[PDB]
Design an enzyme around this catalytic site. Structure first.
Site, PDB file in Angstrom:
ATOM      1  NE  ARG A 157      -4.968  11.886   5.849  1.00 53.81           N
ATOM      2  CZ  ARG A 157      -5.063  10.565   5.933  1.00 53.81           C
ATOM      3  NH1 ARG A 157      -4.506   9.774   5.003  1.00 53.81           N
ATOM      4  NH2 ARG A 157      -5.724  10.030   6.942  1.00 53.81           N
ATOM      5  CG  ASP A 158      -6.285  19.877   8.239  1.00 56.98           C
ATOM      6  OD1 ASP A 158      -6.722  19.040   9.054  1.00 56.98           O
ATOM      7  OD2 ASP A 158      -6.195  21.094   8.511  1.00 56.98           O
ATOM      8  NE  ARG A 190      -3.431   1.718   1.414  1.00 56.63           N
ATOM      9  CZ  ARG A 190      -3.813   2.645   2.286  1.00 56.63           C
ATOM     10  NH1 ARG A 190      -4.268   2.310   3.495  1.00 56.63           N
ATOM     11  NH2 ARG A 190      -3.722   3.923   1.946  1.00 56.63           N
ATOM     12  CD  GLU A 196      -1.703  13.068   9.192  1.00 59.65           C
ATOM     13  OE1 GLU A 196      -2.664  12.650   8.509  1.00 59.65           O
ATOM     14  OE2 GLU A 196      -1.454  12.620  10.324  1.00 59.65           O
ATOM     15  CD  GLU A 197      -1.075  10.197   4.218  1.00 58.39           C
ATOM     16  OE1 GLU A 197      -2.132  10.694   3.746  1.00 58.39           O
ATOM     17  OE2 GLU A 197      -1.022   9.035   4.681  1.00 58.39           O
ATOM     18  CG  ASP A 221      -2.137   1.963   8.875  1.00 62.14           C
ATOM     19  OD1 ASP A 221      -2.223   1.804   7.634  1.00 62.14           O
ATOM     20  OD2 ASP A 221      -3.016   2.521   9.572  1.00 62.14           O
ATOM     21  NE  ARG A 222       2.135   3.047  13.262  1.00 64.70           N
ATOM     22  CZ  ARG A 222       0.842   3.345  13.365  1.00 64.70           C
ATOM     23  NH1 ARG A 222       0.180   3.874  12.342  1.00 64.70           N
ATOM     24  NH2 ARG A 222       0.202   3.087  14.486  1.00 64.70           N
ATOM     25  NE  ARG A 275      -9.009   6.858   2.205  1.00 67.67           N
ATOM     26  CZ  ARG A 275      -7.959   6.614   2.985  1.00 67.67           C
ATOM     27  NH1 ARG A 275      -7.326   5.443   2.913  1.00 67.67           N
ATOM     28  NH2 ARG A 275      -7.534   7.543   3.830  1.00 67.67           N
ATOM     29  CE1 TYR A 308      -3.961   7.412   1.952  1.00 69.72           C
ATOM     30  CE2 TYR A 308      -1.581   7.432   1.878  1.00 69.72           C
ATOM     31  CZ  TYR A 308      -2.752   7.492   2.584  1.00 69.72           C
ATOM     32  OH  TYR A 308      -2.705   7.630   3.937  1.00 69.72           O
ATOM     33  N   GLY A 348      -9.621  20.136   8.445  1.00 71.42           N
ATOM     34  CA  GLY A 348      -9.724  20.635   7.081  1.00 71.42           C
ATOM     35  C   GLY A 348     -10.160  19.564   6.093  1.00 71.42           C
ATOM     36  CG  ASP A 359      -8.903  15.553   3.032  1.00 73.96           C
ATOM     37  OD1 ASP A 359      -8.502  14.431   2.618  1.00 73.96           O
ATOM     38  OD2 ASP A 359      -8.589  16.010   4.158  1.00 73.96           O
TER      39      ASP A 359
HETATM   40  C1  GYG Z   1       2.641   6.320   9.288  1.00 75.37           C
HETATM   41  C2  GYG Z   1       1.226   5.787   9.107  1.00 75.37           C
HETATM   42  O1  GYG Z   1       0.851   4.834   9.702  1.00 75.37           O
HETATM   43  N1  GYG Z   1       0.346   6.472   8.199  1.00 75.37           N
HETATM   44  C3  GYG Z   1      -1.049   5.980   8.021  1.00 75.37           C
HETATM   45  C4  GYG Z   1      -1.988   7.184   8.043  1.00 75.37           C
HETATM   46  C5  GYG Z   1      -2.067   7.906   9.345  1.00 75.37           C
HETATM   47  O2  GYG Z   1      -2.672   7.047  10.267  1.00 75.37           O
HETATM   48  C6  GYG Z   1      -2.985   9.136   9.191  1.00 75.37           C
HETATM   49  O3  GYG Z   1      -2.428  10.022   8.264  1.00 75.37           O
HETATM   50  C7  GYG Z   1      -3.151   9.851  10.539  1.00 75.37           C
HETATM   51  O4  GYG Z   1      -1.894  10.303  10.962  1.00 75.37           O
HETATM   52  O5  GYG Z   1      -3.361   6.695   7.801  1.00 75.37           O
HETATM   53  C8  GYG Z   1      -3.392   6.126   6.464  1.00 75.37           C
HETATM   54  S1  GYG Z   1      -5.078   5.706   6.101  1.00 75.37           S
HETATM   55  O6  GYG Z   1      -5.171   5.034   4.747  1.00 75.37           O
HETATM   56  O7  GYG Z   1      -5.594   4.801   7.187  1.00 75.37           O
HETATM   57  O8  GYG Z   1      -5.891   6.971   5.955  1.00 75.37           O
HETATM   58  C9  GYG Z   1      -2.509   4.894   6.344  1.00 75.37           C
HETATM   59  C10 GYG Z   1      -1.105   5.239   6.738  1.00 75.37           C
HETATM   60  N2  GYG Z   1      -0.316   3.949   6.852  1.00 75.37           N
HETATM   61  C11 GYG Z   1       1.068   3.954   6.452  1.00 75.37           C
HETATM   62  N3  GYG Z   1       1.610   4.997   6.014  1.00 75.37           N
HETATM   63  N4  GYG Z   1       1.812   2.730   6.561  1.00 75.37           N
HETATM   64 CA    CA Z   2      -9.336  16.125   6.381  1.00 77.02          CA
END
Ligand code: GYG
Ligand code: CA
Ligand SMILES: *[C@@H]1O[C@H](CO)[C@@H](O[C@@H]2O[C@H](CO)[C@@H](O[C@@H]3O[C@H](CO[C@H]4O[C@H](CO)[C@@H](O)[C@H](O)[C@@H]4O)[C@@H](O)[C@H](O[C@H]4O[C@H](CO)[C@@H](O)[C@H](O)[C@@H]4O[C@H]4O[C@H](CO)[C@@H](O)[C@H](O)[C@@H]4O)[C@@H]3O)[C@H](O)[C@H]2NC(C)=O)[C@H](O)[C@H]1NC(C)=O
Ligand SMILES: *[C@@H]1O[C@H](CO)[C@@H](O[C@@H]2O[C@H](CO)[C@@H](O)[C@H](O)[C@H]2NC(C)=O)[C@H](O)[C@H]1NC(C)=O
Ligand code: NAG
Length: 387
Positions: A210-211, A36, A194-195, A69-70, A289, A324, A215, A242
């Site tokens: 990204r807010d 992802r 963010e991002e 995610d991590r 999405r 994304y 926002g 957004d």
């Molecule tokens: C570092 C991190 O874990 N970023 C995650 C973000 C984050 O949680 C939001 O920006 C809130 O800070 O969330 C998105 S998301 O698709 O779930 O929107 C997925 C992201 N996963 C990875 N980059 N591996």
């Molecule tokens: Ca937002």
């Protein structure tokens, strides 16, 4: 040898199809990485597709629960654009958040991994580790998930540490041959960043981000590569980019502040100025999405009252999943061109027919010619996939 991007932005009438990898459809009859957060960046010759692997292929017991995610198993993958992430893909670093760019001489990768409250960012330049920084706020150090930008050998990247629902600590790093030569704190009126999707805008770097807090309009971060100063604001356009966000008829925006309209959460996206107009992409659904569209907002970069769009293109029809998206810039003979990629997410949690979570990509590039219509979704039949 160093890229300077010192050419005007290309004329843009819209975007034309550039690349698609069909990775999920292939995953059903082949060994393909689970990924992802993909993106695209190009050296002076050719483009590469990147993504965050899950340390597993899709048809693989280890694909279960890859919605997470991590993990310590995520790595940044890198292939030539259009080569799907097969078993000979190079994992260029350990990362659950990343950004890469080429400065005209070599690749820079920025790779964050480790504990949520004490992550480490590695800086790898020309194939060797040159620097590293620890999380400064002990709350998920994270970065762009799309290409960084280098001018005259100085690469800049945007990084955030801290809350996802309140004031965070954003910093803009200046990296030369992999060494952090300066760090600037986010400044200006962007309240949550963010991002970031960044692009060269000579003599500086401009980002649309990204807010995740208040926002549904997107923040803008402007980076002066010489004096390291930072300013920030929001994309004025009354049509906001957004997800989530309010519907088109009732959404509003603001050039300086978050609009407080379904501001919580978000999705990585992009936009870029063309005079006082703005080119932007966004999902077609205001709430999830689903789908992906591009258009130009007339006076959309300078006037928060404009919802006057033109040149809409459907990239992914409203009935198919997107995800994304981010920008990358490609130098042409006479001008710098703007391209974008769309992550096409399949699986959990939104699709429960399988246990995994992955994506394919589709990619489009600015054009000054003409184009027609279509829809280029992921195309896998989730009901027939390996579980
Ligand atoms: C570092 C991190 O874990 N970023 C995650 C973000 C984050 O949680 C939001 O920006 C809130 O800070 O969330 C998105 S998301 O698709 O779930 O929107 C997925 C992201 N996963 C990875 N980059 N591996
Ligand atoms: Ca937002
Ligand atoms: C985020 O990430 C960073 C970087 O990884 C991390 O900082 C690092 O923390 C570790 C663990 O505390 C540090 O390594 C320790 O260093 C101490 C000595 O430093 C302390 O004391 C000196 C003066 O004595 C001070 O100058 C200094 O500021 C510190 O206060 C060592 O003593 C540690 O070794 C002992 O503990 C280990 C486990 O932690 C044991 O495995 C080891 O065997 C040692 O224990 C033995 O000796 C003890 C007596 O010395 C005795 O009490 C024991 O019973 C046993 O016999 C350890 O090497 C490291 O230096 C830090 N790095 C940096 C760059 O600062 C953060 O902690 C982390 N933060 C979070 C929130 O996760
Ligand atoms: C996929 O992973 C999940 C764990 O996240 C497994 O589901 C759980 O397994 C344990 C042990 O059997 C149970 O206690 C839970 O009730 C299960 N369900 C949950 C947590 O919803 C699942 O077994 C794994 N699937 C495969 C095929 O490996
Ligand atoms: C859009 O949002 C407003 C506020 O919830 C609502 O009044 C309107 O009916 C919604 N749908 C439209 C305009 O199609």
């Amino acid at each position: 040898e160093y890229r300077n991007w010192s050419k005007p932005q290309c004329d843009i009438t819209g975007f034309a199809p550039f690349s698609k990898d069909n990775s999920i459809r292939l995953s059903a009859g082949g060994d393909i990485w689970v990924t992802r957060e993909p993106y695209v960046s190009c050296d002076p010759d050719k483009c590469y597709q990147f993504a965050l692997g899950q340390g597993t292929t899709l048809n693989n017991v280890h694909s279960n629960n890859t919605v997470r995610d991590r993990t310590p198993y995520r790595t940044l993958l890198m292939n030539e654009l259009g080569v799907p992430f097969h078993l000979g893909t190079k994992q260029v670093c350990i990362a659950w958040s990343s950004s890469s760019c080429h400065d005209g001489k070599a690749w820079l990768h920025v790779c964050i991994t480790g504990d949520d409250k004490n992550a480490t960012a590695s800086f790898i330049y020309n194939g060797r580790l040159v620097d590293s920084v620890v999380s400064w706020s002990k709350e998920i150090l994270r970065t762009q998930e799309s290409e960084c930008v280098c001018i005259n050998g100085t690469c800049t990247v945007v990084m955030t540490d801290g809350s996802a629902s309140g004031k965070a600590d954003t910093k803009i790093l200046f990296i030369e041959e992999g060494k952090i030569v300066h760090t600037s704190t986010l400044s200006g009126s962007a309240q949550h960043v963010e991002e970031c999707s960044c692009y060269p805008r000579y003599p500086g770097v401009r980002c649309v981000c990204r807010d995740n807090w208040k926002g549904s309009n997107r923040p803008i971060v402007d980076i002066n590569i010489k004096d390291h100063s930072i300013v920030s604001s929001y994309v004025c356009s009354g049509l906001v980019g957004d997800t989530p966000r309010k519907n088109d008829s009732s959404s509003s925006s603001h050039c300086l502040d978050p609009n407080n309209e379904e501001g919580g959460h978000g999705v990585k996206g992009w936009a870029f100025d063309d005079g006082n107009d703005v080119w932007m992409g966004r999902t077609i659904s205001e709430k999830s999405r689903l789908g992906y569209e591009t258009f130009k907002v007339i006076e959309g970069w300078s006037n928060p009252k404009s919802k006057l769009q033109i040149n809409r293109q459907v990239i992914v029809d409203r009935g198919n999943r997107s995800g994304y998206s981010g920008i990358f810039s490609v130098e042409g003979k006479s001008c710098i061109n703007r391209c974008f990629y769309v992550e096409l997410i399949r699986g959990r949690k939104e699709e429960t027919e399988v246990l995994w979570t992955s994506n394919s990509i589709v990619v489009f590039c600015g054009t000054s010619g003409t184009y027609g219509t279509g829809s280029w979704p992921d195309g896998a039949d989730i009901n027939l996939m390996p579980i």
